[PDB]
RNA sequence: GGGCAGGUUCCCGAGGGCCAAAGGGGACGGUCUGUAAAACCGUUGGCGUAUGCCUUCGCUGGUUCGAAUCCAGCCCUGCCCA
């Protein structure tokens, strides 16, 4: 009903504005038009992208239209939301490329029934939008207006460039608003200025404004900025749930309650009872639910309790329970067990060497670990020797001209958790 | 178009040979640890293993035995001017 749709929306978000509106919008009993864009300036999505497509898929299932608008178009002007210097140019072919990423993996949390989803290009409208409309779109809106945003207050302020065309982004957004007459546009709070960039842009078209939603950000691993591919903080989608299992261990502890409540629907109750058991125990929750979810090929309704013991776990067991639950999770938590306790993991990857690469019947170790993949360079492979950070056998080298025999099969570590088995093939 | 300050590696930055370039950030590796934080010790162009070479100091040319350094013109940014 109306009243308690929005109940299960608010759950969560930061701020929906104006909530008056989108009551209303309810209330009109049809399918609204739920707008998320997102420019795929590189490939791949994230936990912190599916903050906001989990919310898409809470409209979904109380039955209303998710637009995905791929910014191919936007992608190539550059997005200055939360941004200290220009993005660096990227082209249309290149926009376009990353996005089947975006396409392929928006499908894990999105339903893919035509009456609930639609897949957009902005390119579409935005490639013939002609001179005359851009000039109707930038007389809107006023220079004090632009240089009141945080991201050119500051940057005009320190006298850090700001390029024309930073400016132009915002009613490209908002255009595509007008395209798809949005009924709700959602973001996280970055997107704040161009969401409301977007409500004068359709009054301006003769629409009715549409709602905007904003979710909070998804702090990354580093423990302070917002989980990006370019920050290399993120936590992607299609990891391997060995991969995701071990990095949804290592979220720093003041993060735990945010990623609860982002990223599974949990009751605050049973939140703050994960917490009371402690850090670790709530990591290996947080870690076997997200890893689960994400392992299906489509995330269900609701990251739950209900969700959680469906899988094999128990509640009260508050991550003691190591023995039970489904296979990929729980070969990819004793794989975090082994290499925690020391050990080398069972299922590591192949690496087979060319005889050509030998000399003399053997491969210096820096060499060795740079075929494998292990390290960019021989130089740095040869001071991570110096520092202790490679394993040949199990056994830390010391001696960084070690001659290598690849006789037979060899395993190569670097760190803690990177591991390589490598062989000879003539 | 015309002044002045600035352009250095992933970022910010210090700067006639021994400068692959101080220091700081970030990242990486290690100890402690819970594959957390924090603290602490290291590392931070590349090359089969280097008194050798190549890549990196906005560009191009010049000077000098030798240029990141000095010079000339030129591309770019900020502040000032028009
Ligand atoms: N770590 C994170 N936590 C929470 N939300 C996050 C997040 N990282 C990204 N997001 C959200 O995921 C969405 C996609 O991010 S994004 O690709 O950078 N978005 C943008 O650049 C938008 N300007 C894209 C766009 C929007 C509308 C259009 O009509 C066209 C394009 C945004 O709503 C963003 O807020």
Same mark, same amino acid.
């Given at each position: 009903?109306?009243?308690?749709?929005?109940?299960?929306?608010?759950?969560?978000?930061?701020?929906?504005?104006?909530?008056?509106?989108?009551?209303?919008?309810?209330?009109?009993?049809?399918?609204?038009?739920?707008?998320?864009?997102?420019?795929?300036?590189?490939?791949?999505?994230?936990?912190?992208?599916?903050?906001?497509?989990?919310?898409?898929?809470?409209?979904?299932?109380?039955?209303?239209?998710? $637009?995905?608008?791929?910014? @191919?178009?936007?992608?190539?002007?550059?997005?200055?939301?939360?941004?200290?210097?220009?993005?660096?140019?990227?082209?249309?072919?290149?926009?376009?490329? =990353?996005?089947?990423?975006?396409?392929?993996?928006?499908?894990?949390?999105?339903?893919?029934?035509?009456?609930?989803?639609?897949?957009?290009?902005?390119?579409?409208?935005?490639?013939?939008?002609?001179?005359?409309?851009?000039?109707?779109?930038?007389?809107?809106?006023?220079?004090?207006?632009?240089?009141?945003?945080?991201?050119?207050?500051?940057?005009?302020?320190?006298?850090?460039?700001?390029?024309?065309?930073?400016?132009?982004? #915002?009613?490209?957004?908002?255009?595509?608003?007008?395209?798809?007459?949005?009924?709700?546009?959602?973001?996280?709070?970055?997107?704040?200025? =161009?969401?409301?960039?977007?409500?004068? $842009?359709?009054?301006?078209?003769?629409?009715?404004?549409? $709602?905007?939603?904003?979710?909070?950000?998804?702090? /990354?691993?580093?423990?302070?900025?917002?989980?990006?591919?370019?920050?290399?903080?993120?936590?992607?989608?299609?990891? #391997?749930?060995?991969?995701?299992?071990?990095?949804?261990?290592?979220?720093?502890? *003041?993060?735990?309650?945010?990623? %609860?409540?982002?990223?599974?629907?949990?009751?605050?109750?049973?939140?703050?009872?994960?917490?009371?058991? /402690?850090?670790?125990?709530?990591?290996?929750?947080?870690?076997?639910?997200?890893?689960?979810?994400?392992?299906?090929?489509?995330? *269900?309704?609701?990251? @739950?309790?209900?969700?959680?013991?469906?899988?094999?776990?128990?509640?009260?067991?508050? /991550?003691?329970?190591?023995?039970? /639950?489904?296979?990929?999770?729980?070969?990819?938590?004793?794989?975090? @067990?082994?290499?925690?306790?020391?050990?080398?993991?069972?299922?590591?990857?192949?690496?087979?060497? *060319?005889?050509?690469?030998?000399?003399?019947?053997?491969?210096?170790?820096?060499?060795?670990?740079?075929?494998?993949?292990?390290?960019?360079? =021989?130089?740095?492979?040869?001071?991570?020797?110096? =520092?202790?950070?490679?394993?040949?056998?199990?056994? $830390?080298?010391?001696?960084?001209?070690?001659?290598?025999?690849?006789?037979?099969?060899?395993?190569?570590?670097?760190?803690?958790?990177? %591991?390589?088995?490598?062989?000879?093939?003539?």
């Amino acid at each position: 009903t109306p009243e308690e749709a929005l109940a299960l929306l608010k759950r969560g978000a930061e701020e929906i504005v104006p909530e008056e509106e989108l009551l209303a919008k309810l209330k009109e009993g049809r399918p609204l038009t739920v707008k998320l864009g997102a420019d795929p300036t590189r490939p791949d999505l994230h936990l912190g992208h599916a903050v906001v497509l989990r919310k898409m898929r809470q409209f979904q299932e109380l039955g209303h239209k998710v $637009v995905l608008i791929i910014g @191919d178009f936007t992608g190539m002007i550059g997005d200055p939301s939360g941004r200290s210097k220009t993005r660096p140019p990227l082209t249309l072919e290149e926009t376009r490329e =990353n996005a089947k990423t975006y396409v392929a993996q928006a499908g894990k949390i999105l339903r893919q029934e035509p009456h609930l989803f639609e897949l957009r290009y902005n390119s579409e409208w935005l490639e013939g939008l002609t001179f005359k409309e851009v000039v109707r779109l930038t007389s809107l809106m006023t220079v004090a207006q632009m240089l009141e945003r945080e991201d050119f207050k500051k940057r005009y302020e320190a006298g850090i460039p700001i390029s024309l065309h930073e400016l132009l982004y #915002p009613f490209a957004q908002a255009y595509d608003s007008v395209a798809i007459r949005a009924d709700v546009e959602m973001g996280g709070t970055d997107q704040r200025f =161009n969401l409301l960039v977007g409500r004068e $842009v359709q009054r301006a078209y003769g629409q009715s404004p549409q $709602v905007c939603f904003l979710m909070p950000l998804l702090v /990354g691993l580093d423990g302070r900025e917002k989980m990006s591919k370019s920050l290399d903080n993120y936590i992607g989608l299609t990891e #391997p749930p060995e991969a995701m299992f071990k990095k949804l261990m290592r979220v720093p502890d *003041p993060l735990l309650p945010s990623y %609860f409540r982002l990223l599974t629907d949990l009751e605050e109750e049973e939140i703050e009872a994960l917490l009371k058991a /402690g850090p670790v125990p709530a990591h290996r929750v947080l870690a076997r639910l997200l890893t689960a979810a994400y392992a299906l090929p489509q995330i *269900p309704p609701r990251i @739950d309790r209900a969700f959680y013991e469906s899988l094999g776990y128990a509640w009260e067991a508050f /991550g003691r329970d190591k023995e039970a /639950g489904p296979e990929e999770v729980r070969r990819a938590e004793a794989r975090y @067990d082994e290499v925690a306790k020391g050990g080398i993991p069972e299922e590591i990857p192949e690496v087979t060497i *060319p005889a050509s690469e030998l000399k003399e019947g053997r491969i210096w170790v820096a060499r060795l670990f740079t075929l494998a993949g292990l390290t960019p360079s =021989n130089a740095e492979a040869r001071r991570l020797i110096q =520092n202790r950070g490679l394993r040949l056998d199990g056994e $830390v080298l010391t001696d960084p001209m070690l001659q290598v025999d690849l006789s037979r099969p060899r395993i190569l570590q670097r760190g803690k958790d990177r %591991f390589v088995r490598v062989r000879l093939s003539d």
